[PDB]
Amino acid sequence: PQPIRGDKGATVKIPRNIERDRQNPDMLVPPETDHGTVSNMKFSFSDTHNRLEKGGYAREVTVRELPISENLASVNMRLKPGAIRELHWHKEAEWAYMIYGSARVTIVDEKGRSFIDDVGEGDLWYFPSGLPHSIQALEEGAEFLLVFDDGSFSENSTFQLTDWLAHTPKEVIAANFGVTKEEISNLPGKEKYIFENQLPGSLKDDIVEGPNGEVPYPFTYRLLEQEPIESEGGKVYIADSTNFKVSKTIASALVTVEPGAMRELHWHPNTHEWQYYISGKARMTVFASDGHARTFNYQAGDVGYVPFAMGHYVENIGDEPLVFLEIFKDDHYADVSLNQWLAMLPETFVQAHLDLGKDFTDVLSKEKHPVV
Amino acid sequence: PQPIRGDKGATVKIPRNIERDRQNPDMLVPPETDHGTVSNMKFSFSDTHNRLEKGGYAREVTVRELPISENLASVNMRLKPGAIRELHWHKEAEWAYMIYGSARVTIVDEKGRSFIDDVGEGDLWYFPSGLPHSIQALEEGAEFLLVFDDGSFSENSTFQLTDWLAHTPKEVIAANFGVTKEEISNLPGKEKYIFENQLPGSLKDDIVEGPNGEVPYPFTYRLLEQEPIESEGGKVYIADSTNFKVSKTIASALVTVEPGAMRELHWHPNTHEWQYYISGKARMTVFASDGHARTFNYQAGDVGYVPFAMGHYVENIGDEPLVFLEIFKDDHYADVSLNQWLAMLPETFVQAHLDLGKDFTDVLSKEKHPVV
Amino acid sequence: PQPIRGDKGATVKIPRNIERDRQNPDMLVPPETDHGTVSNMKFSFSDTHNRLEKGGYAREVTVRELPISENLASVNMRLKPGAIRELHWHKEAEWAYMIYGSARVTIVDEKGRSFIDDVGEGDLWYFPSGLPHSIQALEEGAEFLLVFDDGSFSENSTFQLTDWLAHTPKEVIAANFGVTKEEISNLPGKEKYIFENQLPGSLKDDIVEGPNGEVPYPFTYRLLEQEPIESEGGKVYIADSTNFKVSKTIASALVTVEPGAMRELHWHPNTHEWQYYISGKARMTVFASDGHARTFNYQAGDVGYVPFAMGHYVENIGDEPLVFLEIFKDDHYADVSLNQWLAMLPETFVQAHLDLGKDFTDVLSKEKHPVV
Amino acid sequence: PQPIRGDKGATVKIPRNIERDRQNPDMLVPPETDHGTVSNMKFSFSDTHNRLEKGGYAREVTVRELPISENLASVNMRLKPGAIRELHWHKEAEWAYMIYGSARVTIVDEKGRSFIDDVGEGDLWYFPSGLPHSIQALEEGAEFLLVFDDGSFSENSTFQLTDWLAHTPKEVIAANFGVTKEEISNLPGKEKYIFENQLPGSLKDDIVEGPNGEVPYPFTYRLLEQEPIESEGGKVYIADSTNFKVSKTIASALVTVEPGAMRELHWHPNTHEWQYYISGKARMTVFASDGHARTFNYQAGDVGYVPFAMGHYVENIGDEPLVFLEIFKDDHYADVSLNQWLAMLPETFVQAHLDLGKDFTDVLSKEKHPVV
Amino acid sequence: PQPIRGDKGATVKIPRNIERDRQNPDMLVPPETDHGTVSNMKFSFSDTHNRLEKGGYAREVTVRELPISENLASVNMRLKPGAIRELHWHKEAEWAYMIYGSARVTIVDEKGRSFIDDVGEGDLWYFPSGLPHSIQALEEGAEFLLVFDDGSFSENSTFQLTDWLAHTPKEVIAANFGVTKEEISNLPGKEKYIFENQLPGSLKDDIVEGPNGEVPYPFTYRLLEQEPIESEGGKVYIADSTNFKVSKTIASALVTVEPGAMRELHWHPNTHEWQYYISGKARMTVFASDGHARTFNYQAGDVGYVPFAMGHYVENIGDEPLVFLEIFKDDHYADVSLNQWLAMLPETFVQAHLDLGKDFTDVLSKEKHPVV
Ligand SMILES: [Mg+2]
Ligand SMILES: [Mg+2]
Ligand SMILES: [Mg+2]
Ligand SMILES: [Mg+2]
Ligand SMILES: [Mg+2]
Ligand SMILES: [Mn+2]
Ligand SMILES: [Mn+2]
Ligand SMILES: [Mn+2]
Ligand SMILES: [Mn+2]
Ligand SMILES: [Mn+2]
Ligand SMILES: [Mn+2]
Ligand SMILES: [Mn+2]
Numbered sequence A, B, C, D, E: 001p002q003p004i005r006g007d008k009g010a011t012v013k014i015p016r017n018i019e020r021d022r023q024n025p026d027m028l029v030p031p032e033t034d035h036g037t038v039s040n041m042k043f044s045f046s047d048t049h050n051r052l053e054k055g056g057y058a059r060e061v062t063v064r065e066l067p068i069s070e071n072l073a074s075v076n077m078r079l080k081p082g083a084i085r086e087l088h089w090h091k092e093a094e095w096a097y098m099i100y101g102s103a104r105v106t107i108v109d110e111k112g113r114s115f116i117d118d119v120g121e122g123d124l125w126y127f128p129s130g131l132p133h134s135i136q137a138l139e140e141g142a143e144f145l146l147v148f149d150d151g152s153f154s155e156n157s158t159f160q161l162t163d164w165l166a167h168t169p170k171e172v173i174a175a176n177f178g179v180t181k182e183e184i185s186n187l188p189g190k191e192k193y194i195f196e197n198q199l200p201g202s203l204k205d206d207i208v209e210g211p212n213g214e215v216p217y218p219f220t221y222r223l224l225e226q227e228p229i230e231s232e233g234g235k236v237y238i239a240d241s242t243n244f245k246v247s248k249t250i251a252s253a254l255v256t257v258e259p260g261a262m263r264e265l266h267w268h269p270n271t272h273e274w275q276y277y278i279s280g281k282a283r284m285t286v287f288a289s290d291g292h293a294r295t296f297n298y299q300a301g302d303v304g305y306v307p308f309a310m311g312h313y314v315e316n317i318g319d320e321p322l323v324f325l326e327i328f329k330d331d332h333y334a335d336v337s338l339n340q341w342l343a344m345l346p347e348t349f350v351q352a353h354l355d356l357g358k359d360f361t362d363v364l365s366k367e368k369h370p371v372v
């Protein structure tokens, strides 16, 4: 491929990265309508350092990789069968989508109430800021996407159980539990983070009863069980604080776009959009106002972003279904459809704006169809 | 006039701006009680670039003009009869006061519900952040004041319908609506922003029905219809989220001060005050604590400001009524009256503070009178 | 006047400031070539609080008034005959231009060397940061413009001799000078700042001799004595560290533009330009790149500004000479003339850019003429 | 490939980007010695929007793409034979390396002196901040790397000749040059930026003589002409203000590493290092102190970065020569070699640190060999 | 002691820290002349965490302890006989004063030149930013004060030789030196930082010769050898870039104040002052302008600070000599003496300011006496 469009552009004369150019057709040769300076809105997990441990791995995309995303960061984590992501907590709230396999999670709230449940493919979980939790993969192992509500998420964000104890005077730990220093001499000298372990037993046998009672709302959500908004070119499954009650700082939508379809032109009136492409290939043009617009290409891995209120669409440019997540740091999901907007205004008023006739306004729909 | 007060000051010996000096009597010759460094709290729309278009004009006062106002910015917009302010949206919430004429506004929410209504002199509107809207002047044309809840409001804040389409691939727009590229070949090549148009028909004929239903709360408010707080020297009309339900981020008050009257000494316990002087002439001293105070003069145009909790008053120093707006970025209006405050404390306690006797405390009023 | 240009704009329908509109013709009705958001680049001293004292006055324009000017601030100071601006020092370096009258200044450096000299109309002075100084007007009194190299210049910037002593334990002052507390009981209880005083004697009688020797370089400069760059429409007097040796952080130019003349199109490749209009009326368009440009009007007082590298010109739009100062926070003055630039390139190359012929390139001049 | 190292890691179970994983072997499977949070230090030009114009193209990597690089930004520009990069200037200083072809550049300084010269493969140029310049490709066309000394470099950074004129009142331009508005009616309505043009004639015929004289120092530099530091595994060509006199804010080094060789372990005691990989494949581990280190892979395009003082090396992991540029925002190039450092200390002292014997210290070299 | 001064103040009624109150007499009962908000200018090393290692200890006072000191940080380091502070480097320049004992230091510059020397009590050293160095105590051990030119100095500031190697792939280290992985298998697994070691031999036997030659300027300085400025109440030894050539970013002064004496009233016209009290007890009032002043007490340890240009003095309030260091981040030491300043001005002019007569001006001295 060459960066040539009509009589514009020229062949590349210096050493280049042909593989990446092939993955970014609309960047090497952008639409003629693209214009102006626009921040980078794309980053691949494959371009990140992968932390390998006995039991799995973890790689992250943060504000240090994608500057525009100051409010959200993400981790792609993998766990082998039975492997455990060590009991820990962090300042940020955590949202997750199980892409592959299944896992058991635990969480205890500030009132001493515990919640333990199994999460399968298509399920989610949300852990409020500061509440301690753990993850243990089941027999198929597990691979999932985690999203934290602070783009600066890093190493100083997570507190591990064994790391805390390893940095607390032995005499203090002993006094705290009413045991002798000798009784805790075998405590780990360093954190585990992720470690291999035998598969757990049935969920029912793990449930712990307590004098504090059951938690008010579940920390897991079966996203694929509910009826999705079904459009002609695909479907959308939404989970925000209105249905997944505990998910107060993260609103999400799983979008599936069939080949030849596209997430329609729209924008969000509430906040920024963070994206993760699960599968397929796409292109999206972000309209930043004042004659500024830039097109980006995305595929599998890839993290995407759409700053607050910017116009956009997500077109499937491949032969397989396009599947991606739309994440928002807010208590609700909300969007304004260009089509629906115009459909709900006087026909002659819209015609006056677009310099088009009734033949165009007649195609407008008062019903919102997310994917066309 | 000369900057002389008693035995202080001297005549100006260098070339000067006599017209402005005459407009700022209390600045050329401040009260003896003024003291210390205080930020500028005054700026005139006449000192701003006026964007002229076919159909009207627009000029703005932002943080780039008045640094102290970081949370609120304003636009003075004028539309000729029938002229349209192009369908658009922005990140900021928008509040408006119709000073002259009338106009029809449209807005569609995130649920596809439309609201269309006519706004006359004395009426307001509030458009939540991100919701698309438009304005079209009626037969008398229109001139109004807009206030946005971000002082950095600028060009990158507003998204125009035609600008978005002009920067979106034709093939994508075609696919989005299910039409051919040929069918949309006449779309504008550049945004319109403000454009001339024939006067619209009756409001009832513009109302659009939809499967989404009517909006929960109106986006317009008839401020002058309600009973105002009537004092001896004037009146105050308040509109905040308690009565104008949708106006969640903007609280406002239209204040009228008769000649020889003044908005009493008070302060706001909730947030900063942004002001716009509709008509008349005034002076206000802002008390910034720790022996700091500065007096400013204001007239017609002029934007004013009072940082959070600073003491102030607004005195009419002209022969005509003084009319101005007090704007706050909050869900409610609130003020503490110096008079009422002291009136509600033990008489001897107040006397102990002021070194004054019963003759003074006897004049205190337990009832709040905004304008005296 | 009305904000109308051809078929654009409309009459003002709301209460307005006609006097200011008349002063800003090119703002009420900007050139058709103006476009885009540009920060405010104009502010009048008449719009500032004037601090009146026994002996004179002082008013300032800082970053709190003109946000764009973060690196430079200014004070318009007036002193009656014999009046003294109290011995003091500040963190910022200070540059001054004597507009009216004359004054005697004193300064002692870090090596204990003193410099005392008289400054008349057209003369300058520069006091390095932290070096203590004073100003005392002579028989005609004095009014001058001071420029400090920090836009945040304020009250916490200046240290007064008597204020320091008033806030130092009496026993410490006594010990410091080897006197008794009784001997210094008459020290002022508060600072003086500016105070009336008898006219001083001849300069020669004030000169103080010392064991430290004479200062290496003078702190005053007779700007009008040197030969100015004389152009067809005016003249320019430049004073920077290359000729006024001590003026290391301030470069300046006094520009005079005859009626019908203009400071040519140019830009500065080194830093921002701060302006003060001494007399006359002008207009200037600042070109901010990427299709952004805004025109401003200026007269007498007025402070102006041109951010680093932005294109500009200053046209006299009055019947009297236009006189203004161009100030830069740098050790040298430098500008690039549009005319000279093009004149120094191959004729056909320039023609290829402008789509103009030899008739245009023939008028280009290889010699720089600041005012045409 | 799979993210597995010994008994750590696991196979990827979700959809992935195999092509990128293959390009980042040391990221999918990092060295066991990597540890801790480290910012991203790699970004590919292929992952950027390419601006196509009639005559060539331009793509950039800025702080908006690579956050860690706050002080330097880069543009990969391509010009067809005879094509011109429009006369312009910017706030940032500009440094360039001609990778392919040749071009003629022009520049006029603040004293009206012009410099015109041809630049071939391996040559450089440096244009001080604010000085106007242009580039015109010769018969082979040209493709080069530009580096600007501000990571925020963007659209508001560059001022185009025709854009300035298009936004200046016609009457002002006419008055500025002493011509009629009619004489300049054909001036472009919009900027050109990059435009096709006939090849220029011989350099000698373009040289323009002037009354200001010749520039003091050349703005171009023949890097490959000088003798490079020749090591066993490659060579280094350095150009900083000590040899390329005008290049005051950019120090550079062209490094060639033969297969099986590596840029030795070292660090820079002066400032951050910005890198551009011209050809080949490499890996580099950046040591960030306090047990933090991360390895990155690089190839052709790719921009790299090494924050100030961090330890690093650049190993050729391919079969072809590795060629890259090391850029520093400083007036000189400087590095400290780990080998040379230890070689210049008492042998027993070094042994005491490393717990190694004379067999190791005997291999240390007092001579610096950049590439081994 | 009780916070009572005349009829002001009262006894403390709640649990208190009597020991600290006794150490801060002028804080529990400030001078009547103190007034206004002033930042904290005092912090004790005894109030910091002490890092203990085999061979010594190290504690620091940074911007995290003393916020006002943003440009300078300090470490109090102790080394046992023969103990070594591991070979390392950092981004900050380092200055040191040997309080007790002696030590041998090494440093190699960017040109491969080594400098090795012994430092005794009263001696200094300065290591430019990024240059690698080490410290090894001699037979008496050593304790010294280090000052770094960045208040944010922390763990991410220092790079250790063994830490770098421990985080570099073994195969890369092997290739870098031309040895086998087996030959370096004994390299430390973790950094040493500070470690015990046998005392070194004579300095002459450690000197390493090289093909690069001797360093241009010494990195150590014998402060107590030069003649100090001798005043009536004490002496001052100054070391800045004018005499200790390499010390470009740190200017210093060792001040000794006899009982009953005081560092006179003065200020610094160049930059902030950072202080370390070696021995004795003192009090200092810092005058911050605009009627703001606060008094602080200091003793042994204690770090002090005086923001740029603020007036101050340092009075010995004990029976033993007061010894402290005055540090400045600049290439020279400079101060303005209140006494000398007034002594160098016309007598009647000074009298006009202070409302004092000839009896006072007669005591002024044209010679600067730092300690009176
Ligand atoms: Mg466009
Ligand atoms: Mg007062
Ligand atoms: Mg334009
Ligand atoms: Mg480690
Ligand atoms: Mg006081
Ligand atoms: Mn977690
Ligand atoms: Mn979206
Ligand atoms: Mn709007
Ligand atoms: Mn109020
Ligand atoms: Mn001064
Ligand atoms: Mn200029
Ligand atoms: Mn350029």
Ligand SMILES: [Mn+2]
Residues within 6 Å of the ligand: D266, D267, D268, D273, D306, D312, D326, D335
């Ligand atoms: Mn390097």
Ligand SMILES: [Mn+2]
Residues within 6 Å of the ligand: E088, E089, E090, E094, E133
């Ligand atoms: Mn060190």
Ligand SMILES: [Mn+2]
Residues within 6 Å of the ligand: E266, E267, E268, E273, E306, E312, E326, E335
């Ligand atoms: Mn001092």
